Write a protein that binds this ligand. Structure first.
Ligand SMILES: [Ca+2]
Ligand SMILES: [Ca+2]
Ligand SMILES: [Ca+2]
Ligand SMILES: [Ca+2]
Ligand SMILES: [Ca+2]
Ligand SMILES: [Ca+2]
Ligand SMILES: [Ca+2]
Ligand SMILES: [Ca+2]
Ligand SMILES: [Ca+2]
Ligand SMILES: [Ca+2]
Ligand SMILES: [Ca+2]
Ligand SMILES: [Ca+2]
Ligand SMILES: [Ca+2]
Ligand SMILES: [Ca+2]
Ligand SMILES: [Ca+2]
Ligand SMILES: [Ca+2]
Ligand SMILES: [Ca+2]
Ligand SMILES: [Ca+2]
Ligand SMILES: [Ca+2]
Ligand SMILES: [Ca+2]
Ligand SMILES: [Ca+2]
Ligand SMILES: [Ca+2]
Ligand SMILES: [Ca+2]
Ligand SMILES: [Ca+2]
Lengths: 315, 315, 315, 315, 315, 315
């Protein structure tokens, strides 16, 4: 079964939890252990009900309160947990795009791994938060082959109900072959077109047909025929169709690798997947990497930052 | 029974009414007695149907036609009567905030005396008429304890289905006591939090428990522990819980007291409550004040302004 | 039966059609015969499915690809066929109003010949496309009696469910008579008022009553009492009530008259009536004018423009 | 000499005056006598320097502080006195137009009595404050002959350097005569045209030429040929050309007449002419009305409101 | 000498002219002969003074009055002549871009034949009229090589003070040769780079160096190496450097060729060059075409449209 | 002397540098060594000249070209170097406030260390880039004492021309003493008010008077009477007045401390002070820290990022 690590607190009362957070912040200092405990043990919908009771009881929004009480990564991870899911991704896209430079990788994690219905919700929430239109913003901040793949992803046009038909999986696998390996350059239109429109079941069957004609896997073929941003965008889709839990277990491992941490990725994957398949992502992490995801966080992170994260994650 | 003073015209024809109003304004002069009569004897829903036939028969809006034929308080009262009810309060709020100064008292009349579903409607009609967000605009034009009470009010978060439970009514009455009378200062958070979230039946029970532990009523305690705008904000909620008809009979009485009139209060309350509980507000007014509301208006107001008001109100 | 000239392609595949249009523009040149054929033999809803698949396969919009491959009227007509129908009218309006001058005649064709629900959709699509409000925009770009008829039109307030009542048809016929013929001036309010509010069935009955009291038809009386823009605005309503097909067969004939063509009218009527009643407009054209519609276009137009138009029209 | 009643404080220090206001609001209560004293004995440019130092010393704007400490008419007058002069009128216009109704009379006081240069500054300050265009807003909120008079005033196109030429003063006086008195109706275009473009010296000479061809004055001729808003509009210009001080002495007298006060007018004229010609408006008031301006305000107004107003006006 | 065909009316009075136009439109009908006369015999700056007096005398804008009195091409030409010159061109770009399709040719006439300082003004007038940014809009409505040449044009970065240096003219001519003729493809960056940055004196020198190394002129080389929009974009710059008057005499000739007229071009070139170099364009027309520009218009055009146009042009 | 580490390239040609950057990116790969070289050895105004020529030569902006060729921290440091100086800071503010959380420290680095003139430019560049108002944005994203210190900073109201007057330096040092050390609480208004308004020379004199009355330095008293955000806000002003170069040397040292780097601080301070006083900040770094700033970067950083940063810094 695919499930996340956060489950709704049983015998929840938003009034009482709003009043416990007010008490945790009252006076000088803050009781972070209380804040961490409430946020990390209520589901996102319960956190949204705590938030309406806090503003009705107190006249101030819980968000504004935390930004004055908290700092740095604990503030960011806490604040992430109160964002309605769709909005959080909508906001993470914004951050990737409108800074100095681009988090190319944040855009791939969010647009390339998504269903049609999720793309339609991330597009809506961005419009609502930012008044601008995301495809118009993606087209302003990206160019070339990469831009084109993210414009495809924003349409929500995959033929998700297309059935596995092996004669066609074979026609497409051959088509991709001629585009890549079968010629000197690469016709990128054919990579983008097939990986953007075919259902995920039908894409699986293509990948298998491709290994019977070629002596490289489709991953190897993209890895050789493509460079940079579009190479990582197209491999994200291949990894999503083959095994989504491994894609994120990978992206998480890389956040924690070497010196320091890429907390931005860490907060983003842990928080977004927490109520969808963070349980599965954890078993795939362990199997691929030796250590547990818990152990990994426990070593790379510190303070309350580390605690909040380790209570979302669980052992 | 709680009822207003304006009941829908039986055998109403908006085409014929639209035609009458054009005839009452044609030429030099205006036939005010005819405008007064159609506007005051039609319910607001009928006046909205008159409004659509006027613009489709004559290609100009009835409002624009009135602003030319009328002046001063008769124009203001006549135009008040044509506004959709939600829009009229959203518009009164705009006028209280975005002038020279603040009509602190219009903002309390509209936000502190409302149910969750009416707050939600006044908020939406505002965003529609003004493109801005009311909670954002109240936060720009107010400060401190009063701003927080109006931010609580705009959430629509009262637990209106909360049942009378005496043990709790008793625990909150005790908590309000310590926050006020039982200490030198005043913890205002406690006052704001209890009056803003409990249901009105549970609040009634609290006020009763408070008098058994204090020798003062909750109104006296507020009157003493608080000043200015928040003192008035908080007593509007207590007065709405105990007797809403008396709150408004009071506010009307003060509009008409002394020299001149506060027509802005007078038009706003008469017109908003005309199809809700103006009958009951009229009986409480006489009971509290000696004179009838009819008689009060007849003395303080003049011309056609006086007649339009006296026809909405009735004897 | 009333029916247009374009019927949905049976065994339609949007993925394959998108692919064929990419193949038709690939390289230097364009294969216009291929574009003409896909556009002219798919219904507008099928063209919208081809659009979503083109953008998901290729990551560029079919519109942007045609603007670069095509030019002049073939670009205009091809692009007109791809617009969602409501949008295409909201766009036409924009073009009439906001240039050097006014295409007075576009505004009448679109606003004066429409049902309540169609007026409400054109109004919506305009607000969506252009963020401004259409009635605010028609009031900025028109004045006087004309402005007033087009504001009436924009209210969607015709009493479409008004039943044929001869006694009343007779009272209004007589009212229009006094306003016009029965007096030196013209009371325009009465011509506007009756033509804007009465159902089309009840209007038919009035035109009949009018010929029994007058020796002139309502057309001749409008033709004489009125000038210019409003004279053409009021005759568009009468012609729509008596015979809509003839209104357009007329408009079309005039587009193709003399030296050159008014392609802007030609593309607009052909394309908006193609799936509603272009077949009926074509019979009425022949009947009124001797030659066929097909024959007329075939003579006044050229290139691929002419072929596209001839395929949408049929023989 | 023409001069106002408010002169710059000699040995002014904005830092000290900012600190004195902070001390007058500190704590419970407010020391209104101290706020009245600084605001009323500092010229408007000194008040703006007090405003910058308050916000740099305490990090809150002075305005926000006074809205919390003050109420009603004292809040409104104290806040009027802190507005930059051009912004105060741009705001007074906004208030006259976008409420329930129109203060027809505020609009004429501001737009009909002004020079080209002032109109151009009220226009600019409005667009700044409100992002909208004043002419576009006057055209939305007014109709007909009055709207045209107000659009004329907003152009800033009076030929102010036009010299007195009696042959033409005579030609125009005659033209005005034929437009009005010399015919049954009124050609308003001629009244509008000559009163809006000719210089004020040349206009004076015209009024004189008129009385030699008519037995009525131009005032009487306007008074009879015109009604309502445009009659008051055109009389404002005539009284501004003949005697501007008397125009305001009149409007002030009427603000204070009868029961109550029209404080809105009262604050508006006293505060806007305080540094221009409130000295002269005061002599003309006494001379026309018997009592002093000071004496009038002292009877019609109360509290601290009356004190502020009595310090701006002087004896 | 380079000069236009409209010269400022000597003994011009804007008040008297504004009055003459009101008289021309008063009543039923319009006196087009009078409007044609004032418009065509006043310079553009005088027309802007007539425009302010008309609005200050009558309270309505001249433009709005002409849209109600006029129709079709006379309305368009008479309104073109009242537009401030910069605005006219910003408005023409808007009309080329934001309709159904693109007038690719309007964009090249305006952007590819301009100085740095004129581009800078057309950019400014667009942002002013439209609130949007012209480069942003040109990037939305165009793609590819063409887009890139128009984004170059909009920078205003031509090195206008660069001096004729034959060694470099020779070096660039050589560079263009290799880009084009000297290879199978075309490196377009090299054509775009040299024709967009070098001064017009230097460019002339290059064209001359080019003919000594090639056997084709740079025109023939562009004509062969390029296609469509970019081919005409690049040839507009070469024809502006060699002879601007011939570029427009050609554009004008094609507006009038065949059946009908392209009035849109005809009004646009005649009105924009009328005070710059229409007299030169007229001598080049005759020289190149046989007939006079006057005689051409006289045959292709009609009504008052034809007259207005023949007055602007002269014999 | 106070000077930065980047000096204008002598014999600079923007056309040739723009061509060099095109060649460095052409094809697959990028020649980062060339890009680093031009960006790091041209002053910012020279970089703006390169930018205009790149877009006029190639029709695409240099920023868009780098985002596609670069990645990570080299992208951000390269793009940082191309921003107009005022825009860069206005962009840094935006990134500090509008993400998940607040970079409290970037806001103090920027707003608390600036002159009046600099604050006024950051305010303008923000409004321009972001259409919003910075003060309004700081007031949205910050609360309490901190917000008030940053609102004071945004006023540009420091009396920079205030002269050192020992009697007053002593009066204020004693006021700060009673506000802090001389009482249990802290009156923060007094710390805010003296630090925000007095000139930097007068402030130095105050700090000296304070140590004669107290036994602790003003830094120790702030360190003890204050907490968090406002403690760091007030200490940045005290460090700015005493020694600006040490404030930054301190901030840089902390960016590079421990595991990882805070690149965002590193790029921000290196880039902003490069042409102002990076030479002095480097001497103060060595003196305070043992190692050179060069040596520090060279250890904490890698790749091309490290090279770019080491070339802007110098040895
Ligand atoms: Ca705390
Ligand atoms: Ca914080
Ligand atoms: Ca290959
Ligand atoms: Ca690590
Ligand atoms: Ca009337
Ligand atoms: Ca009115
Ligand atoms: Ca107490
Ligand atoms: Ca009274
Ligand atoms: Ca092609
Ligand atoms: Ca095209
Ligand atoms: Ca008649
Ligand atoms: Ca024809
Ligand atoms: Ca106080
Ligand atoms: Ca107040
Ligand atoms: Ca008369
Ligand atoms: Ca009075
Ligand atoms: Ca006319
Ligand atoms: Ca027209
Ligand atoms: Ca070639
Ligand atoms: Ca022709
Ligand atoms: Ca490259
Ligand atoms: Ca990148
Ligand atoms: Ca202390
Ligand atoms: Ca480090």
């Amino acid at each position: 079964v695919v499930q996340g690590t956060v489950k709704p607190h049983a015998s929840f009362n938003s009034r009482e939890d709003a009043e416990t957070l007010r008490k945790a912040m009252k006076g000088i200092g803050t009781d972070e252990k209380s804040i961490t405990h409430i946020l990390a043990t209520r589901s996102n919908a319960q956190r949204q009900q705590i938030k309406t009771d806090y503003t009705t009881l107190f006249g101030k929004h819980l968000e504004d309160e935390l930004k004055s009480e908290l700092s740095g990564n604990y503030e960011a991870a806490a604040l992430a947990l109160l964002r309605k899911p769709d909005e959080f991704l909508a906001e993470q896209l914004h951050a990737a795009m409108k800074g100095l430079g681009t988090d190319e990788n944040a855009l791939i994690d969010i647009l390339c791994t998504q269903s049609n219905a999720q793309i339609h919700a991330i597009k809506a929430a961005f419009k609502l938060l930012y008044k601008e239109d995301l495809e118009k913003e993606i087209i302003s901040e990206t160019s070339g082959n990469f831009q084109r793949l993210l414009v495809s992803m924003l349409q929500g046009g995959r033929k998700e109900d297309e059935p596995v038909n092996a004669a066609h999986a074979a026609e497409d696998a051959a088509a991709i072959y001629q585009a890549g390996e079968g010629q000197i350059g690469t016709d990128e239109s054919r990579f983008n077109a097939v990986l953007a429109t075919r259902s995920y079941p039908q894409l699986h069957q293509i990948f298998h047909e491709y290994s019977k004609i070629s002596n490289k896997t489709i991953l190897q073929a993209i890895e050789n025929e493509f460079s940079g941003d579009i190479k990582n965008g197209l491999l994200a889709i291949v990894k999503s169709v083959e095994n989504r839990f491994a894609y994120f277990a990978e992206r998480l491992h890389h956040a924690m690798k070497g010196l320091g941490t890429s907390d931005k990725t860490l907060i983003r994957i842990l928080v977004s997947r927490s109520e969808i398949d963070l349980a599965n992502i954890k078993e795939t992490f362990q199997a691929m990497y030796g250590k547990s995801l818990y152990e990994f966080i426990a070593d790379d992170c510190s303070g309350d930052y580390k605690d909040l994260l380790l209570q979302i994650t669980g052992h």
